[PDB]
Design a binder for this molecule. Structure first.
Ligand SMILES: N=C(NO)c1ccc(C(F)(F)F)cc1
Ligand SMILES: N=C(NO)c1ccc(C(F)(F)F)cc1
Lengths: 300, 237
């Protein structure tokens, strides 16, 4: 069980760690988060009390180094940084743990929510979407735009998601215009799965990463990417049977976890109605359709 | 964006553009079967592709063999239209290719856009105007060549005859849309107006009668009255 220590908390802030969150007061004696489960990526995220503009945060994996948070008064944010001196990290954390100045990652033992939301997410692939190679952790915030958004303006600060565009030469074989537009199986299976992603595990991981950035940061471009990746599967008549079953589980946990009060902005009516009621896979998402109908029958 | 009354004069500027109407592409007669069910039988159709500035009409005849063994024909018809329009553009020399294609029905937007992906600089636009191009098959010579076709065929016409020698393309398009609206609202009466004097002949190389300028005024007046009447006979006014 690993630990993300905090140098201090000089400004009042709501701190999130995965799906949990707690309020820290200005200069409250808070020195970090312990008992973080090993084996998963994690995200630690922030919303300042004074300026709710810019939710921001850091994706990280404690297996990859010793990370900590120190507030920067010049840039005005809580920054993640890696401590390369292992002895200093052990000693500072030991003092902090002995004075019980840390909250404990509050994982109920029955609870697989975080595993289910991050099953296919890897930092090595996350670093490809968020390019900042001098760090082992990845910064994301509410405002960052995606490559596809920029094409339609600072490239170093962009989310490099896989570009999906149903009315593009990549998606449409010359001579198969109607066929490929109405059944996207060749775009899904040949172009994307065989060509780009290399396997469905990579397809699911980016899709999951796109959702989590939408939910935690309100990142609109990420919500666009999530929906596009769902629509591409649902609009394909030919999808491996293991993929459909896994997609149903993936989406079920995403819909389960979504704050009820954010469904209006995070869920696209057209995509979900098309996917659940009109598409080739309208009958293949039983768990997702059942939770959507009992939780958001209005959207439908 | 969409073409409407506010930007109407754009049709007659010097940027090449085409209207595409797919109304008459998939045409059926619905009838009873021996068992008392209903079935359709297709008949030849056409794509109506028109340059509103020059009057050049590219009439692609859609022979019933193109539907053989196909399903969801109304959907296929939109994609066949887009295929044939794209083929036509590719067949034209670059300096004759349109800079915009205006579809008369919004359901043609995605099929045409997808078929024209190779032409990113050609704008595909809808329109808010309720254009009467469905009535093209009420023009006897157009109807004749469509029904007689035994194979896919493209036939080229100038839908304005020689009118552009004497009037502008705005005026010619207005005359054409008036004639077609009349034929659409009451075909028999419109044809009576155009054809009840056999001495005003249609030239072999034309579609409409050889009216003098003054006769065109009288004809146009008669067409307006017919349209307003039918709007009367319809809504009772
Ligand atoms: N200010 C620092 N270094 O100069 C510093 C403060 C705290 C840590 C921690 F152990 F918590 F990770 C690391 C570095
Ligand atoms: N192979 C990929 N395609 O880019 C890919 C796989 C996983 C992720 C993740 F979000 F999970 F980090 C991102 C990308």
């Amino acid at each position: 069980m690993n630990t993300v220590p905090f140098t201090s908390a000089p400004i009042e802030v709501t701190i999130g760690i995965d799906q949990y969150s707690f309020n820290v007061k200005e200069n409250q004696p808070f020195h970090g988060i312990k008992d973080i489960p090993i084996g998963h990526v994690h995200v630690i995220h922030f919303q300042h009390a004074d300026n709710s503009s810019m939710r921001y945060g850091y994706w990280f994996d404690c297996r990859m180094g010793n990370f900590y948070i120190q507030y920067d008064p010049k840039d005005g944010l809580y920054k993640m940084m890696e401590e390369r001196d292992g002895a200093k990290f052990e000693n500072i954390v030991h003092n902090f743990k002995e004075r019980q100045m840390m909250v404990s990652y509050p994982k109920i033992d029955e609870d697989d929510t975080w595993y289910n939301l991050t099953e296919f997410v890897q930092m090595d692939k996350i670093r490809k979407i968020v390019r900042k190679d001098e760090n082992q952790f990845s910064y994301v915030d509410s405002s960052m735009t995606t490559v596809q958004e920029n094409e339609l303006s600072d490239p170093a600060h962009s989310l490099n998601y896989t570009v999906i565009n149903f009315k593009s030469r990549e998606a449409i074989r010359p001579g198969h215009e109607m066929e490929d537009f109405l059944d996207k199986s060749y775009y899904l299976n040949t172009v994307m799965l065989q060509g780009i992603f290399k396997n469905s595990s990579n397809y699911f991981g980016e899709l999951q990463f796109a959702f989590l950035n939408a939910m935690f940061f309100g990142n609109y471009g990420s919500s666009l990417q999530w929906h596009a990746m769902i629509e591409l599967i649902c609009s394909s008549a030919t999808v491996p049977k293991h993929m459909l079953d896994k997609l149903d589980e993936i989406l079920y946990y995403q819909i389960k976890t979504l704050p009820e009060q954010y469904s209006d902005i995070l869920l696209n009516e057209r995509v979900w109605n098309i996917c659940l009621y009109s598409s080739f896979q309208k009958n293949s998402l039983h768990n997702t359709e059942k939770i959507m109908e009992n939780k958001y029958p209005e959207l439908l | 964006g969409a073409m409407n009354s506010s930007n109407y004069a754009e049709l007659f500027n010097n940027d090449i553009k085409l209207f595409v109407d797919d109304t008459n592409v998939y045409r059926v007669t619905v009838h009873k079967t021996f068992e008392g069910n209903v079935a359709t039988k297709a008949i030849n159709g056409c794509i109506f592709t028109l340059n509103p500035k020059t009057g050049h009409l590219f009439l692609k005849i859609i022979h019933t063999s193109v539907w053989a063994g196909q399903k969801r024909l109304s959907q296929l018809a939109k994609w066949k239209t887009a295929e044939e329009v794209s083929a036509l553009v590719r067949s034209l020399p670059k300096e004759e290719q349109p800079k915009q294609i205006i579809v008369t029905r919004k359901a043609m937007l995605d099929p045409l856009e997808v078929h024209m992906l190779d032409f990113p600089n050609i704008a595909i636009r809808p329109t808010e105007l309720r254009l009467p191009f469905s009535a093209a098959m009420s023009i006897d010579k157009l109807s004749d060549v469509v029904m007689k076709a035994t194979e896919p065929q493209m036939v080229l016409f100038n839908i304005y005859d020689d009118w552009l020698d004497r009037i502008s393309s705005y005026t010619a398009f207005s005359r054409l849309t008036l004639l077609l609206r009349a034929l659409k609202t009451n075909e028999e009466s419109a044809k009576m107006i155009l054809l009840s004097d056999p001495t005003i002949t249609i030239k072999s190389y034309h579609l409409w009668p050889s009216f003098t300028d003054e006769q065109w005024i009288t004809i146009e007046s008669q067409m307006r009255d017919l349209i307003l009447t039918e709007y009367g006979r319809k809504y009772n006014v």
